[PDB]
Amino acid sequence: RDWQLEKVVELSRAGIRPPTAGNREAIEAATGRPWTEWTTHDGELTGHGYAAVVNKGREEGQHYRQLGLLQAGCPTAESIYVRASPLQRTRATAQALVDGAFPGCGVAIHYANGDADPLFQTDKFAATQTDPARQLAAVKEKAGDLAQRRQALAPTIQLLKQAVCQADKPCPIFDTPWRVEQSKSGKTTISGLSVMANMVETLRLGWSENLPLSQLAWGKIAQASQITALLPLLTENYDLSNDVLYTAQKRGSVLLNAMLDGVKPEASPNVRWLLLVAHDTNIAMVRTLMNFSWQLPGYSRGNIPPGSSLVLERWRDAKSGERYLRVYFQAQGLDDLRRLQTPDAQHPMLRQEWRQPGCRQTDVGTLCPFQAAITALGQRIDRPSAPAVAMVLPK
């Protein structure tokens, strides 16, 4: 064996949900019409979603057993520790991963007893909140000329409009111009853009979910490429919220820091696989601190599909004993999610590896000298926004 996988740290998005209750309100207002009620309640993990997460978890358990990271059969407390955001959908996604990865093993997942996990719901904690003024300036300054941003996305706006606007009923959202707005709690959003992004997320999920076409966008969206063509609105909005450096630094530092620490040797707890299941906003903030940009086929830049994941693997060269870090983002494509495709040679997980000078290509992926990879990924972290967190939750 040339290379030995030693530790996985992974940050999963929740699987397929219907729109959240907030989304639904905003998108039915914005289009003057009701949108499909799913078989799952708003905000929760759909069965289809769980099926898809189980599929990924099944391959991942097999993959990490084959690589010798995990022992055969049922895991122990040394094999994996799973910590999920306390929302229903992330708990259920966490169950779904271990359901796939450890068939029949009744593996428990952990989550915080409140409504807030200091890794995830970071706006609920003093050290990890944004300052309203700073946030506004940072968003305003990344946004720049918003009318010009809107003009560049006009074709994409139009595709969205033809998909979601009833013919001749008015559709106010496509009409409002784009401004930075800031609610009394300090959340910033981009008028028109955000809700459009919410719409696009919802269409992507409905696609992924395998909704009937008539309940996805009233028959208008019939092939994956039409979801793909809407996704630059969602990237635009990510660029102007979660992936705004300052926001990622106040809200995401604690998570990246807990991930880099978890991938370090002597980590606590001592487990071979540290699995964190949380939200797209979390992944986006983390990957922005990592300055890791990806674009997977069928998706637009930075896109975070349901049940996708950011992974840090620490590997050891069998010969020299030297340590390396591999970093990648993985997801399934639109149709694979729709079809509950089990990932395999003819239908592989989509994946992009992070790289920087010094990384080496190997049989097991792009491997980067460890210390210099940890230093580079960690550079953008705001230390005062990264309190240490005890990774093992209580019961």
Side-chain angles (χ1 to χ4, degrees):
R1 217 198 278 275
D2 279 347
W3 296 102
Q4 183 65 56
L5 174 54
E6 296 199 297
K7 221 317 168 56
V8 169
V9 174
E10 171 167 23
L11 171 63
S12 188
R13 188 180 172 196
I16 303 181
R17 55 167 173 71
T20 64
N23 289 175
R24 175 185 294 290
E25 200 47 41
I27 79 198
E28 303 182 335
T31 47
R33 77 201 292 186
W35 280 48
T36 304
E37 294 287 329
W38 302 24
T39 244
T40 301
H41 303 277
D42 278 353
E44 302 186 357
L45 179 76
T46 69
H48 177 97
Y50 191 108
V53 176
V54 170
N55 290 341
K56 169 219 168 206
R58 181 196 304 318
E59 154 70 28
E60 191 175 5
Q62 284 164 195
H63 180 66
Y64 288 145
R65 272 188 294 283
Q66 194 267 292
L67 288 177
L69 179 62
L70 294 172
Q71 36 192 262
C74 292
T76 75
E78 334 310 273
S79 312
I80 186 174
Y81 179 81
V82 185
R83 168 165 173 159
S85 168
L87 275 67
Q88 188 280 356
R89 65 172 177 276
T90 48
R91 295 199 280 143
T93 292
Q95 290 177 177
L97 282 166
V98 299
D99 206 353
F102 305 109
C105 299
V107 182
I109 56 108
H110 302 274
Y111 55 94
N113 307 285
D115 279 346
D117 178 319
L119 299 167
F120 300 133
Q121 277 73 43
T122 49
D123 54 337
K124 297 299 155 159
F125 294 82
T128 57
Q129 262 153 38
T130 44
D131 162 72
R134 309 278 317 270
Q135 160 103 295
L136 185 55
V139 175
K140 275 188 189 253
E141 145 198 295
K142 188 161 190 189
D145 174 13
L146 276 165
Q148 178 157 29
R149 272 183 181 274
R150 197 202 178 176
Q151 195 42 50
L153 284 159
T156 294
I157 305 179
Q158 189 44 46
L159 301 157
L160 182 57
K161 176 175 176 146
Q162 284 154 220
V164 302
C165 292
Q166 12 178 21
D168 269 77
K169 206 71 65 294
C171 225
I173 201 86
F174 300 87
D175 282 338
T176 99
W178 291 359
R179 313 196 216 299
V180 191
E181 283 186 299
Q182 181 171 56
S183 77
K184 183 86 191 214
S185 70
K187 297 184 163 271
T188 68
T189 46
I190 313 288
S191 58
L193 170 63
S194 306
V195 176
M196 271 172 195
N198 294 165
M199 282 179 219
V200 160
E201 186 56 42
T202 298
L203 287 175
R204 174 270 277 290
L205 295 164
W207 183 266
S208 304
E209 159 86 341
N210 199 24
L211 283 187
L213 302 181
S214 58
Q215 291 165 37
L216 160 61
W218 302 274
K220 313 278 179 172
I221 278 177
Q223 67 182 66
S225 71
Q226 301 163 280
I227 296 303
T228 296
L230 303 176
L231 296 177
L233 291 153
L234 179 54
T235 291
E236 198 82 355
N237 194 238
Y238 267 68
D239 289 337
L240 312 176
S241 46
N242 294 121
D243 297 311
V244 166
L245 180 61
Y246 167 82
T247 308
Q249 303 183 306
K250 302 284 320 167
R251 291 187 70 214
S253 296
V254 53
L255 179 45
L256 178 60
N257 186 75
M259 294 174 59
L260 301 188
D261 297 346
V263 87
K264 281 176 181 165
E266 324 302 318
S268 169
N270 173 324
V271 291
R272 266 334 87 206
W273 181 9
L274 170 63
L275 171 60
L276 309 181
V277 182
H279 318 278
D280 52 22
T281 51
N282 311 105
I283 283 157
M285 297 180 311
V286 173
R287 58 88 185 289
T288 284
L289 298 178
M290 287 177 64
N291 197 209
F292 182 15
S293 203
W294 61 74
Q295 180 166 334
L296 304 184
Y299 285 120
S300 63
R301 173 179 45 87
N303 184 272
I304 302 174
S308 68
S309 69
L310 230 192
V311 176
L312 310 185
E313 298 175 337
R314 181 178 78 243
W315 290 86
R316 207 186 203 115
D317 181 330
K319 155 218 191 91
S320 64
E322 253 182 52
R323 276 153 166 169
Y324 295 82
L325 196 73
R326 182 177 178 230
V327 179
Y328 53 95
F329 176 71
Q330 69 193 317
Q332 301 185 275
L334 288 154
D335 280 348
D336 288 334
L337 285 172
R338 187 161 177 85
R339 306 168 44 98
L340 298 171
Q341 174 71 58
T342 155
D344 63 9
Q346 217 206 295
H347 291 105
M349 281 256 268
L350 308 166
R351 183 155 65 241
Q352 189 172 330
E353 291 185 306
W354 170 80
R355 68 215 336 108
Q356 66 160 3
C359 304
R360 44 219 233 59
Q361 184 65 55
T362 73
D363 309 321
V364 299
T366 303
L367 259 48
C368 309
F370 185 88
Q371 194 45 54
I374 286 309
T375 294
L377 293 168
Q379 226 188 135
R380 260 171 272 254
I381 282 193
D382 186 51
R383 317 276 356 145
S385 311
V389 336
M391 174 72 52
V392 171
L393 283 163
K395 234 322 277 75

